[PDB]
Design a protein around this nucleic acid. Structure first.
Lengths: 177, 116, 78, 66, 50, 149, 136, 188
RNA sequence: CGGUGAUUGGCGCAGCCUGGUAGCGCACUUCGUUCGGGACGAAGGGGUCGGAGGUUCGAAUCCUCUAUCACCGACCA
RNA sequence: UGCCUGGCGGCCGUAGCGCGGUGGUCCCACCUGACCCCAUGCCGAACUCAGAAGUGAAACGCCGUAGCGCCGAUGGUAGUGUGGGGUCUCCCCAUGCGAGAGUAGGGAACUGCCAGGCAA
RNA sequence: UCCUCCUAAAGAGUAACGGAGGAGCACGAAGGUUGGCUAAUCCUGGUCGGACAUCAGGAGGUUAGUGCAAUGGCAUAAGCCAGCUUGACUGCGAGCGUGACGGCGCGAGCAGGUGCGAAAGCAGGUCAUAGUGAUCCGGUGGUUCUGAAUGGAAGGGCCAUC
RNA sequence: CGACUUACCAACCCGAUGCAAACUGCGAAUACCGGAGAAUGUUAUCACGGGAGACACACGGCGGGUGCUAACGUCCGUC
RNA sequence: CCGCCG
RNA sequence: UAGUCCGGAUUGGAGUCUGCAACUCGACUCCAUGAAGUCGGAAUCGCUAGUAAUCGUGGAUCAGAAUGCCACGGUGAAUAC
């Protein structure tokens, strides 16, 4: 948690004069980072979900939760309660050490990088990026993979506007094309 | 919501409990000051109330709001219950998990002599 | 021509058997009903068919309680 | 956190070409050798060579030679 | 129809039996319930028979 | 699913999938029993077709081969199961144990196969059920058993 | 022929036509065609009294029809005995109590609106009258 | 028990009278003024099936058969018999040479040939619309003179004989149909 | 009038029964053969189930209303 | 006794939302830490535990506001019990009961038992 | 024959070849208990990924769900999930409900023996209401209750059942 | 690879408007069950026992189904 | 063996 | 032993040459790109000797612009019952 000790008095201080809060509990703090890997093609192989969940066990630090299908749709041929993804809700201590590991040495490994979008906010302060490979994370051996598919990182904060959570990310410098 | 999710969690064993006319022991945990009181079977008047917000309890404890400060409540509720002739009660979790401080308040009540 | 209807069932004889203040000996069925249209209250039990049976040789009395106003059936004790 | 179900989370020591030795916790294993990090990456010098690309009259007047 | 009827025979000394049903062609493992035996006045294990 | 690592606690050696279909194509004699699940009911019924029932090692809804509760299945079927199998003629030869056990219990181990063979037949039996029965050792013993007692 | 779209049930009971009306005041328009008699109007009769009323007011102006049928009328065929089921639906009526403003009109003068509802009311089986939008 | 009356059944309703199962192909139900009702039923024998014509009255008619026609997978042959497997439930099934009749050629292996099972046992086997097979005994068909369709016969791997054109020799795996028995094309 | 079963590729017919695919023979398309057409050999394409309304996660299939094409009836006086 | 507050009710929208303001010594809420008690079909987020640096932001309580929900007359209308009547698929008279909708209007709940705080 | 709604006229009941639909089961968990949890559908943001899979947030409020038709019911949830489990237990049963009768339904409590829960307590199947057939004859198991001179047995009876 | 002009169809909401046996955020009259009390009525009430007959109904009013808001039609309710 | 006609 | 250091199409850029002129519409180079393609269905053609096959060179037409045509040598078969 390098960039939590950084957060406690150089980003909290930074956002109290940008949006002139009267109370330190008004400052946007980040709550959780949820890593969905929407595998989709676990209809063919169940062990195709097992390699994909094994890649979240490396990109994150902990074992993923496989996600059942809420409804059942015949446009994709999935039944009710048939496993169709895997999520990692990392929060607390390991989400700071991931967010350190995300923006510093995993964003530069993205092939043909220009910047992250300044419009990938859902009107509440919650960012969502989506990567197209596993191999932007060094925890992949580059040889044990057999599928291109990446994941999407969602950063749920306690912000309120799209600007108020943009400015929280922008103090971690979070490149923003 | 944190609060009203627990009220409906508790209501199943409140309405069932007043259907038996039971003089009930109502515990109320908070991150400081676990509370406890004993309520008559009408539901409308109480008989015994002892808790660590009282100044005759908190002076003898270093922190009010841990397990041994919860065992100081359940002994004092049972010491005041037997004066009124209240032997038989029914414990009410009030939506709290019967695990930590609210177990010790029922432990120290069953140790001191509050029969249930 | 022909018809496709003409089918019904033995009327189940539901409803309230014992009304308001009308002494009922314990175990006396009061309301025979589909679901819990009328809910069980003081001294009155509810069966496996939502038949609220009396439990104490007394009166009856319907009410409305809580924040849902569900006719409720209690038993005054005389 | 649970026992025995999670992968090992031993702290590593990263290193990129710029001398940026930076200790992080990960699950890689032994060590880690990097190309670029958030420091020394072509995001601030990269758009410097993106603005001045287009233009054709200055292309032509080098074939004018005067 | 499909769900045939079996006969749980008591594993006590007597021959009291409960009778019930079981769909055999979906869950063909035998029933090992623990029911009350009114000859022994105990609560011994019953086992499926025909 | 989980049963690719669950019956690994049930003692079986090569737990898996079509890795054992490469071994059918090589013709390996290291196993005697093929047990599957309704997950794995699409493999040997489609890939190892002849070579699973020529030597006979399949499973369906007749033998107890393929439930989905394979954890507590193989906690005993690794130990003592001896597969009562057809022959073209009258014969159904089963196997007695090592000679140096408690031999009086073996006279129940031969007897507690009777109540399972007489438990359910083909509802089309002929004159007798059990005509001739002789419990040989391997090559030398002869003991005429009775079908009645 | 004004007819409902995808009704709940095909055949309904006969029912009585008792009571007073609800379309009493002229709401949408300036001049109305109010019923005095108790009858019922079929969908052919609404639509025939509309063609005889749109025509007189040559199409400019605006006309509101305050009644819709939404009631099916069954009919036993000829040479068929009683029983053996309800008849099949042939046409759709609207039930008219006394006081029901049937049609309305706006955008024409007071005399052309007068002299068009009379040509429309000759197509109706009920006795109607002429009413004007009243304040309050 | 499933008893049927002859004014009821439409087509395909499998019935069981005089010791044999019958499929109904079609039935025309007539009844005329001042007569009773009869149904001139065009049945089909199921075990030895050629055809049969019965003209039932309005009463009575026959019990039904346990007659399931589900998809089975041909996978095995031994001596006489031919074993099959369901791809839905994986239950065993054993067919005989009287049940295979006049179709022992057309299966090769892993074929989804349907069977009709009667009363818990199969008597018929229907091989698919096409199977691909291999020619093992065919002359190396030379043109020679031939001006006018040459058509040489080919003995196949399964002991069938088919008429093939003059460009398939041996190991030229060719697919045929089973309903007639003609060459259609060559698989490559 | 009703009573009963079908309307699936340009044509005619299977599939439905028991829900997860739309095939078959002709033709038509290209090539080859031929002095050319016909025959013949090779490659290939084209329907999405008469229409409507549901049931179901999902309908050519199961359901109801229909459509106009077949068949069978239209008794006793 | 008077304010604030917390548990348990009485009642059940005149009591519910919206909008504007407001409170931290008490209490309460977030908050702090979690190796453990216990805990996550992954995650102390929740549950649980150990504590008290910070803030009243959220939430909660209180206050103000009718912008909606809700309450709501009197009069009339509809209906109808009984008895007569008519130009009798509908209505009328005598008598008794008499809505629903809408209108004026009210209205930002009230209240009991205990405990804590603070002023008397 | 059975179940649901309407006709049915606000107690119950109520007919027609009146208007609409369903049943001839399923389940050893889909039953019991304890502990928790809250839907449908749109909206934005997001790798493959679209009208629609999974993730996140919001609006929304039970328009969802309920093994299966319809009605009544359901937040204390009867709906969803997890652990332990066999009360889907034997002998009775005050008291009513409903049928012309055969019958059918509800049932606190009592004794014995269990389960779950710290406990108060709940549990003699399932949200309720369809999922079904009387006798006679006969089959199997149990119980010395009778047992044609007596002793057995056979056959009857009772009990469980087919 | 993209759109420009755009005589027209029109969901969710908002305002107004009707309809329903199988619609209800509302809701009578009567009828019904039960309790108290007075007058009145040859116990008119109930239970048991002997004997029956009857189980083809008709019209009229009201509330309806059905039919044509046809029938001295038909089918229930109640007098 | 097959081989139609302009 | 791979669509690979195979194959070179297609295409972006930068040029040279000829000619009044290189957009329609040239050849050539350079850098980048790196496609189909894994020996070809029915059918079909050429060749019996310095031949087939394979490898390069030259000329004519012509400012420039050939894989064609016309000529020249290198290596050099198999088979004919």
């Amino acid at each position: 948690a390098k960039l939590h000790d950084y957060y406690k008095d150089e980003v909290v201080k930074k956002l109290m004069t940008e949006f002139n809060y009267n109370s330190v509990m008004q400052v946007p703090r980040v709550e959780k980072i949820t890593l969905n890997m929407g595998v989709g093609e676990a209809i063919a192989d169940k062990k195709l979900l097992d390699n994909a969940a094994a890649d979240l066990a490396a990109i994150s630090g902990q074992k993923p939760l496989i996600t059942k299908a809420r409804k059942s749709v015949a446009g994709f041929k999935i039944r009710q309660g048939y496993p169709i993804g895997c999520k990692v809700t990392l929060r607390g201590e390991r989400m700071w050490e991931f967010f350190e590991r995300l923006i510093t040495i995993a964003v530069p490994r993205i092939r043909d990088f220009r910047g992250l979008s300044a419009k990938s906010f859902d009107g509440r302060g919650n960012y969502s990026m989506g990567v197209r490979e596993q191999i932007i994370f060094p925890e992949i051996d580059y040889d044990k993979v057999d599928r291109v598919r990446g994941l999407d990182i969602t950063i749920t904060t306690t912000a309120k506007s799209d600007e108020e959570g943009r400015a929280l990310l922008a103090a971690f410098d979070f490149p923003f094309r | 919501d944190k609060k009203s999710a627990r009220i409906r969690r508790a209501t199943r064993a409140r309405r069932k409990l007043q259907e038996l006319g039971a003089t009930r022991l109502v515990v109320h945990r908070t991150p400081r000051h676990i509370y406890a009181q004993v309520i008559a079977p009408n539901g409308s008047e109480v008989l015994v109330a002892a808790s660590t917000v009282e100044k005759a309890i908190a002076e003898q404890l270093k922190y009010t709001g841990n397990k041994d400060a919860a065992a100081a409540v359940g002994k004092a509720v049972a010491e005041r219950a037997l004066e009124k002739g209240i032997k038989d009660v029914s414990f009410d979790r009030s939506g709290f998990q019967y695990h930590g401080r609210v177990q010790a308040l029922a432990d120290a009540a069953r140790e001191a002599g509050l029969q249930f | 021509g022909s018809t496709r209807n003409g089918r019904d069932s033995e009327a189940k004889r539901l409803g309230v058997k014992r009304f308001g203040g009308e002494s009922v000996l314990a175990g006396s069925i009061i309301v025979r009903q589909r679901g819990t249209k009328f809910h069980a209250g003081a001294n009155v039990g509810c069966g496996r068919d939502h038949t609220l049976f009396a439990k104490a040789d007394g009166k009856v009395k319907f009410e409305v309680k809580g924040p849902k106003n569900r006719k409720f059936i209690s038993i005054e004790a005389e | 956190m649970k026992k025995d179900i999670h992968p090992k989370y031993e702290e590593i020591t990263a290193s990129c070409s710029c001398g940026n030795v930076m200790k992080i916790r990960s699950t890689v294993g032994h060590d880690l050798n990097l190309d670029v990090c958030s420091k020394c990456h072509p995001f601030f010098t990269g758009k410097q060579r993106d603005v001045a690309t287009g233009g054709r009259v200055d292309r032509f007047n080098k074939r004018f030679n005067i | 129809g499909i769900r045939e009827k079996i006969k749980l025979v008591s594993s006590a000394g007597t021959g009291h039996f409960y009778t019930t049903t079981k769909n055999k062609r979906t869950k063909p493992e035998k029933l090992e319930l623990k029911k009350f035996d009114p000859v022994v006045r105990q609560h011994v294990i019953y086992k499926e028979a025909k | 699913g989980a049963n690719a690592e669950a019956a690994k606690a049930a003692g079986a050696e090569l737990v898996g999938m079509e890795d054992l279909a490469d071994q059918i194509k090589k013709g390996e004699m290291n196993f005697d029993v093929v047990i599957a699940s309704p997950d794995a009911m699409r493999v040997v019924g489609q890939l190892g077709q002849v070579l699973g029932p020529r030597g006979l090692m399949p499973n369906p809804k007749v033998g107890t081969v393929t439930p989905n509760v394979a954890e507590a299945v193989k906690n005993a079927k690794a130990g003592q199961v001896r597969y009562r199998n057809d022959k073209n003629g009258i014969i159904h030869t089963t196997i007695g144990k090592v000679d140096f056990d408690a031999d009086k219990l073996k006279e129940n181990l031969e007897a507690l196969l009777v109540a399972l063979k007489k438990a359910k037949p083909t509802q089309a039996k002929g004159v007798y059920i059990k005509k001739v029965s002789i419990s040989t050792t391997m090559g030398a013993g002869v003991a005429v058993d009775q079908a009645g007692l | 022929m004004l007819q409902p779209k995808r009704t709940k049930f095909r055949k309904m009971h006969k029912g009585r036509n008792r009571g007073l009306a609800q379309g009493t005041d002229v709401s949408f328009g300036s001049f109305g065609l109010k019923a005095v008699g108790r009858g019922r109007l079929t969908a052919r009769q609404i639509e025939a009294a509309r063609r005889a009323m749109t025509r007189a007011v040559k199409r400019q102006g605006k006309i509101w029809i305050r009644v819709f049928p939404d009631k099916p009328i069954t009919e036993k065929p000829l040479a068929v005995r009683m029983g053996k089921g309800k008849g099949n639906v042939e046409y759709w009526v609207a039930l008219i109590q006394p006081g029901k403003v049937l049609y309305e009109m706006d955008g024409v003068p007071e005399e052309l609106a007068r002299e068009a509802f009379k040509l429309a009311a000759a197509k109706l089986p009920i006795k109607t009258t002429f009413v004007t939008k009243t304040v309050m | 028990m499933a008893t049927y009356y002859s004014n009821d059944f439409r087509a395909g309703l499998k019935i069981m009278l005089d010791g044999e199962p019958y499929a109904v192909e079609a039935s025309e139900f007539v009844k005329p003024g001042k007569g009773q009702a009869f149904a001139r039923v065009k049945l089909r024998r199921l075990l030895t099936g050629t055809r049969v014509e019965k003209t039932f009255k309005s009463t009575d008619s026959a019990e039904g058969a346990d007659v399931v026609d589900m998809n089975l997978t041909y996978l095995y042959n031994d001596g006489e018999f031919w074993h099959f497997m369901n791809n839905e439930t994986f239950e065993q099934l054993s067919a005989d040479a009287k049940a295979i009749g006049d179709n022992a050629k057309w299966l090769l292996d892993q074929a989804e040939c349907i069977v009709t099972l009667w009363n818990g046992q199969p008597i018929s086997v229907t091989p698919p619309n096409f199977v691909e097979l291999e020619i093992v005994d065919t002359d190396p068909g030379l043109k020679g003179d031939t001006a006018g369709t040459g058509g040489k016969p080919a003995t196949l791997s399964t002991g069938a004989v088919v008429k093939v054109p003059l460009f398939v020799q041996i190991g030229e795996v060719i697919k045929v149909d089973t309903r007639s028995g003609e060459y259609v094309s060559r698989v490559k």
